[PDB]
């Protein structure tokens, strides 16, 4: 035997760096090294522990707190990979994803990926280098292990092809976490907010009733996918810690049981070492090696996305909101709102030179299919333009939406021969999130402008544009009469109107045959 | 119900009575539990279904 000290049956097995993290679940099959039937014995905690001789034993009774966030999914996966062992620049433990993430959450996009992970460390233990062990190897390793024509895709199936030389041993807390932010009152650190929240759960801080603090918290719980995994420790106690009736009781029972349910939970910069470095010959070392890249190819493969998390519907009903009849402006306009339902909001209105009854185009509408928080409604309404000084008893203004933080308007709205400057009046209009808008380049196509009216202030309405927009349906004021608007005036705009980009927005049809290639949505 | 009118009720009997509980019969040591400490509802069970012991 190899002794009764909790960890020892984890060290110098094979270990799938594409499973789970630090957890024995992902140790292989067979043990490589014959660790010899000399035994230690050491004290820890009043207990006596065996354990070989040829490893050590460093007891360190302390918590380590860890976070991996990231608003990118592969950003994520590469924090997770760091600082085990393992050389190059390598996504590893691809099979954690989704035991700490449903599968539609990795997909989607505009979700925070966060593990805030609590290991609680009674001790490590750790191996001999690799030269060292080269005369420890069991028999049948070796022989695959050095033998020229044993494939390094059979080696590495067979004995994984990295194992297990350093670990931490005691218990693991994963409190992972997909957050919708944009619907987040996003003003604190996601990170922090986690950490304060997994905290407050196990009962390392009370939070007080109506703070900041719970407010936050409240806010990440309520809108996040939460789970709570255990890699060593009492089985069965993530429930009761996660949701069940007394958390912070369930959690130090399982903290308190951990010297009886220790188990590998955490890996240090030393704890992965490859198979590669075991063998006798340096020609031998250098195939193995030079084979990683292909055994890794599969896992290495890219999350599948939902960037198209706008549901366009480009073609709504059409109602007249105004004609600036009276205003005595030179040229007609008339605008238009899109009729909203279902979730579906307006951006802008539709503008014409003319006084028809009839829209002469469409201004499209977008759902938030996702629940994502991309639409979110104006904080308020500005003036680009009213008609003080024309002397017309009706009034004839041009308003911009004020976007929340982070948010932009895609269109003005004009309020045309009204009783007092009454702002809009629009439940459905939203603004849409930085992340699927681009700032306005061009302003082209000008609809119209007030000239004529002999009101102080002036303002032309203009087609805003972008690479990569959807050609726009909508407006924005100009305070002034210049023909083309110049870059102080397409600079006025940035970080409050933009356009939505193309690669955010797609029709039910396009929707429906991107979402039919994601799995499980 | 949180924000219930019994809520405020209760609320209001417990923090402006003084208040014990007395077992009499049953598994002993289970009164503190349900009445102040972790988990009263399953201190509470283990008693129930305790009583024939």
Same mark, same amino acid.
């Given at each position: ?117 609590? $290991?609680?460390?009674? +001790?490590?233990? #750790? &191996?001999?280098?690799? *030269? @060292? !062990? ?115 009781? $369930?959690?130090?029972? +399982?903290?308190? #049981? &951990?010297?009886?349910? *220790? @188990? !590998? ?119 680009? +333009? ?136």
């Amino acid at each position: 035997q190899l002794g009764n000290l909790p960890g020892v049956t984890s060290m110098g097995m094979g270990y799938d760096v594409n499973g789970l993290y630090a957890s024995p679940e992902s140790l292989l099959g067979q043990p490589l090294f014959d660790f010899g039937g000399e035994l230690d014995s050491i004290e820890i905690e009043g207990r006596s522990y065996t354990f070989p001789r040829s490893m050590h034993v460093h007891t360190y009774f302390h918590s380590d707190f860890k976070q991996d966030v990231s608003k990118e999914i592969e950003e994520y996966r590469e924090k997770m990979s760091q600082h085990v062992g393992v050389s190059g620049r390598y996504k590893l433990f691809s099979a954690s994803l989704s035991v700490d993430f449903t599968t539609t959450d990795q997909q989607l996009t505009e979700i925070t990926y966060s593990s805030t992970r609590e $290991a609680h460390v009674l +001790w490590y233990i #750790s &191996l001999p280098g690799a *030269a @060292t !062990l080269r005369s420890m190897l069991r028999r049948d390793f070796r022989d695959d292990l050095n033998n020229p024509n044993m494939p390094a895709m059979e080696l590495f199936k067979r004995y994984g092809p990295y194992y297990i030389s350093e670990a931490a041993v005691g218990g693991r807390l994963d409190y992972s976490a997909a957050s919708k932010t944009l619907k987040m009152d996003s003003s604190q650190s996601l990170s922090t907010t986690a950490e304060m929240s997994y905290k407050a759960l196990v009962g390392e801080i009370k939070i007080e009733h109506g703070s900041e603090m719970e407010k936050q918290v409240n806010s990440f719980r309520s809108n996040s996918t939460i789970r709570l995994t255990a890699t060593g420790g009492k089985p069965g106690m993530t429930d009761r810690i996660l949701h069940g009736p007394d958390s912070q009781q $369930a959690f130090s029972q +399982w903290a308190e #049981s &951990l010297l009886d349910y *220790a @188990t !590998l939970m955490d890996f240090s910069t030393e704890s992965l070492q490859p198979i590669w470095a075991l063998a006798d010959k340096p020609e031998r070392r250098v195939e193995l090696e030079d084979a990683f890249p292909e055994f890794m190819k599969q896992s290495q493969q890219s999350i599948p996305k939902v960037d198209k998390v706008l549901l366009m519907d480009a073609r709504p009903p059409m109602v007249k909101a105004g004609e600036d009849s009276g205003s005595g402006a030179s040229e007609d306009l008339a605008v238009f709102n899109p009729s909203t339902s279902n979730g579906y909001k307006m951006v802008g209105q539709f503008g014409q030179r003319n006084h028809a009854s009839v829209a002469d185009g469409h201004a499209p509408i977008f759902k938030d299919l996702f629940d994502l928080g991309v639409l979110k409604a104006p904080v308020g309404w500005q003036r680009v +333009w009213d008609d003080a000084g024309s002397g017309k008893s009706k009034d004839y203004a041009c308003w911009r939406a004020i976007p929340p933080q982070g948010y932009r308007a895609l269109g003005d709205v004009m309020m045309l021969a009204t009783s007092g400057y009454n702002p809009p009046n629009l439940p459905d209009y939203v603004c849409v999130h930085q992340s699927l808008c681009a700032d306005v380049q061009t302003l082209q196509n000008r609809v119209w402008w007030d000239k004529g009216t002999g009101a102080r202030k002036d303002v032309s309405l203009w087609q805003p544009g972008a690479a990569g927009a959807v050609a726009s349906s909508c407006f924005a004021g100009v305070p002034n009469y210049n023909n083309p608007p110049n870059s102080g005036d397409i600079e006025r705009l940035r970080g409050s109107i933009a356009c939505v980009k193309t690669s955010a927005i797609a029709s039910m049809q396009e929707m429906k045959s991107m979402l039919s290639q994601h799995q499980g949505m």
